[PDB]
Design a protein around this ligand. Structure first.
Ligand SMILES: NC(=O)c1cc[n+](CCCn2ccnc2/C=N/O)cc1
Ligand SMILES: NC(=O)c1cc[n+](CCCn2ccnc2/C=N/O)cc1
Lengths: 540, 540
């Protein structure tokens, strides 16, 4: 009887499961409860710690996925299904997972904590692509990941109200971080060495925890993959959050005709609706046809965030912090088939100039005509203004730069200039197994499978070079979690990864070739997004 | 084994299964192949008869559903999922079903042949709501139902070409009718007394078989429930069919740029695509925003239909034919939550005037502004031009009259005036169990469960009166199948159902109350759609 699969934590006892990898076993504790189930009167409220239990909680399998929209744009297609729920939906979903090496470490060990993305409306810690076994086996760190509420359940906000304050999904994540502080030692993990990493909305979440004092004490380093809290999609204002919550209420019959609509009556009516009914009307509250925009996201209300992420990033002192940040080569391409005219995943998407110009308004919603003209100016090649392949790549750059690359470059420079040690990458390898079309390149999200070492899975069909590549990346991430520095403390031979500075703006390319040092994260394009375009809006 | 579960037909031997009902058993032969699988090079081609087979084909369960779009507007909702595929999808789907009384009839028995609807893009003979057991037990009829190809697989058409001539789904249905002629006697059925019945696109199908000489000899009576072949959604012109097939081809990368163009190359490239890839782009070829319009429907090309259904209906000689036709009380309401602004199944859908005016353009697509104005004039109550509930009901009337009621009334009068004996009904009972909101009333499709006797299913929660009502309706349908006359052959007690005539236009209400005779199928509204609005379009 393997005793390493039995563990006690502050709330009670647990039984885990042994997971195999080609390099040897790992111990996993899947489905640990960290909150009271946020159901009934608790819908929309901050999470409450899980009261202790008697007996042995089974932690041999993932728990339920939090209620969420399910992507049906392409039934049966691996490229989208890999992100969809792979356990039943439930509002009873606040559970977390721990992978720990075997044998259990005897000395405290650095902890990696994964926060999944999914635009704040989807995602689950149980997805096959977030399987922590290969990372824990290869680098002998401890890995934690949590579920947190998404969509209306995590982020519906009637600002000011007690009944739906907003941001409860971010509090779910915080509660889990408090849980790691109090219990990760029982797994051999070092609560004084906790590195958050996250992708897309999970990166925005990691960043929001940097900027929230109650969370900032629960971790020591940060990794932000393809996302940032200052993204145009990552936060929303009090007025717009209240409008979205109120329209959601209207769409599900709340409040009943002739009844008052103050915040208490509205949330109470919302709390009587079946969860799926809320899910089914979520996309219908966005103010305009768009891509890369999500209905229920963190709200800037003075509580979890005392000011906007932009204000807090500018004023912040980040001495003592190490950050790893990065982007994939083609951040925008994946979003174009969700609404840009002329795009299809099943053809070459060779759009016309008219389609490009309409696409700019979908990819940059809610901006004046003069602003759109400025976008078209910067992104047209005026020697080939109607070449469809260039227009396709250009709209991909518009969406990616506006939503990911330039918010990230912005954050990276302000952090580096104000005290933090920053490392930056661009991920340029396209999986040999990628099922999206070739024209999308390296889409948003397709470095994750390499960070988690999925190529080592013997049941998959990756190449031998991709396995070596994956091991390289896991070493980088674990080095950063251990020491604050992705460079090997022992290999002065291997090419080095220099820090990112607001001046030299150096970053490395991650692909099958050895590291290559480059300068500037699309500096010219991001000067347009970050410096000029705002001034353009002020003078309307 | 029971002897009567074993049957031989022209192609080989079958084993059926015994189905229970509260009144006694029935013998069912589910999943009989009637065509060669229309796969590979046979995709888009007319069906070929199923070659005979060795041994016993198992006919104990339903076979596969033809590839089709799956409704995701409301995940988990009974009201939509009752229509979704309940067997796996396959291009190998040309199977039919035979229910027969136990014990097997010894003298030839009248045959009812069900053709399902689903807008020509969806549907299956296996759906629970088409369970033929209660009709066959209660009325000792033989019941047949077939699968036929839908969507692009049944109705993509490059007119003229041999590679994709169109209407092959209608040819599937005909092959099944030829099969009933050659084999139904083996089940105790009388091939000289075959009554086709069908709902929505199945009723349009039944109507198309009336107007096609090769089909017309395969049957003797017709029931058209909530649909007609002259409906604005039920057929499409050669040019528009070619445009839709070509855009579908484009959306899936056919032809590979820039090689290709002619119909042979286009269809060959389409035949190499996974079926699901075609399904995934089906809705993106419709010319504009609309409700009650479908991409791939029967094409008027001079072959299956030598002329438009309207022309053939007007010229036709229908002596010797008996027809039953009818509509539900609220033909339009279902469709409004699929596109009309302001509508939602989860609220009261109390639309504003603005929404109603925009809805008219969605419900009456591709008409001039002046035509839309005429629709608004006819459908506004000018004493209450802004009352939300009246506007909600008015747009429902707009969609239902235009798409169903007035095409049916038109067909009914031309048939009766030109030699057919016609009976007409309006179905006015709203199921006690109906899951759609109360404001939708008696939606499109919700008489089917009463015609098939589903209230007798003891695992369901219908009322005692709905069971009696169901039995009364099954009597009418079977009486009409046996004698051509829904009226009880001798019973003078029960109130009488008088024929529909182009002069008196009498019809009956079907609900829990005894029959009531009424005159005029929305005569004033249908005069607007059938007589005036065409003249308004002629002078643009
Ligand atoms: N209008 C719809 O029915 C609808 C369908 C799918 N979606 C999924 C949105 C996916 N998406 C768009 C931009 N970015 C994303 C996902 N990022 O993870 C949204 C709305
Ligand atoms: N791909 C899409 O977003 C989509 C668009 C329209 N539809 C139409 C749904 C079905 N429908 C609309 C009008 N009438 C019907 C069904 N009639 O049976 C489905 C999917």
């Amino acid at each position: 009887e393997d005793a390493e699969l039995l563990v006690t934590v502050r709330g009670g006892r647990l039984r885990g499961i042994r997971l195999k990898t080609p390099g040897g076993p790992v111990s996993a504790f899947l489905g640990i409860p960290f909150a009271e189930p946020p159901m009934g009167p608790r819908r929309f409220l901050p999470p409450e710690p899980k009261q202790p239990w008697s007996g042995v909680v089974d932690a041999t399998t993932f728990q339920s996925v939090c209620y969420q929209y399910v992507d049906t744009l392409y039934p049966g297609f691996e490229g989208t299904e890999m992100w969809n729920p792979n356990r039943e939906l439930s509002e009873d979903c606040l559970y977390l997972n721990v992978w720990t090496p075997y044998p259990r470490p005897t000395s405290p060990t650095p902890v990696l904590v994964w926060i999944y993305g999914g635009g704040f409306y989807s995602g689950a810690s149980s997805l096959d692509v977030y399987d922590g076994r290969f990372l824990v086996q290869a680098e002998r760190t401890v890995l934690v990941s949590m579920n947190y509420r998404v969509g209306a359940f995590g982020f519906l906000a009637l600002p000011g109200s007690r009944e739906a304050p907003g941001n409860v999904g971010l509090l779910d994540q915080r509660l889990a971080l408090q849980w790691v502080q109090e219990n990760v030692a029982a797994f051999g993990g070092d609560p004084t060495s906790v590195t958050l990493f996250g992708e897309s909305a999970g990166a925005a979440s990691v960043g929001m925890h940097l900027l929230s004092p109650p969370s900032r004490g629960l971790f020591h380093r940060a990794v932000l993959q393809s996302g940032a809290p200052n993204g145009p999609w990552a936060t929303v204002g009090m007025g717009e959050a209240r409008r979205r919550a109120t329209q959601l209420a209207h769409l599900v019959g709340c409040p009943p005709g002739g009844t008052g609509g103050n915040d208490t009556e509205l949330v109470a009516c919302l709390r009587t609706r079946p969860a799926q009914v809320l899910v089914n009307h979520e996309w219908h509250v966005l103010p305009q046809e768009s891509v890369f925009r999500f209905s229920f996201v963190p709200v800037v209300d003075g509580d979890f965030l005392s000011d906007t992420p932009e204000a807090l990033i500018n004023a912040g002192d980040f001495h003592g912090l190490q950050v790893l940040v990065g982007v994939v080569k083609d951040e925008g391409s994946y979003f174009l088939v969700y609404g840009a005219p002329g795009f299809s995943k099943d053809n070459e998407s060779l759009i016309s100039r008219a389609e490009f110009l309409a696409g700019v308004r979908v990819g940059v919603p809610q901006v004046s005509d003069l602003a759109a003209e400025a976008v078209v100016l910067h992104y047209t090649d005026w020697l080939h203004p109607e070449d469809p392949a260039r227009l396709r790549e250009a709209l991909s750059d518009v969406v990616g730069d506006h939503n990911v690359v330039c918010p990230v470059a912005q954050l990276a420079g302000r952090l580096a200039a104000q005290g933090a040690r920053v490392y930056a990458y661009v991920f340029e390898h396209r999986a040999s197994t990628l099922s999206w079309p070739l024209w999308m390149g390296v889409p948003h999200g397709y470095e994750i499978e390499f960070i988690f070492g999925i190529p080592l899975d013997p049941s998959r069909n990756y190449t031998a070079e991709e396995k070596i590549f994956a091991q390289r990346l896991m070493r980088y991430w674990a080095n950063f979690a251990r020491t604050g520095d992705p460079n090997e403390p022992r290999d002065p031979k291997a090419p080095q990864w220099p820090p990112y500075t607001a001046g030299a703006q150096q970053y490395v390319s991650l692909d099958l070739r050895p590291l290559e040092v480059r300068r500037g994260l699309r500096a010219q394009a991001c000067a347009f997004w970050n410096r000029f375009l705002p001034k353009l809006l002020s003078a309307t």
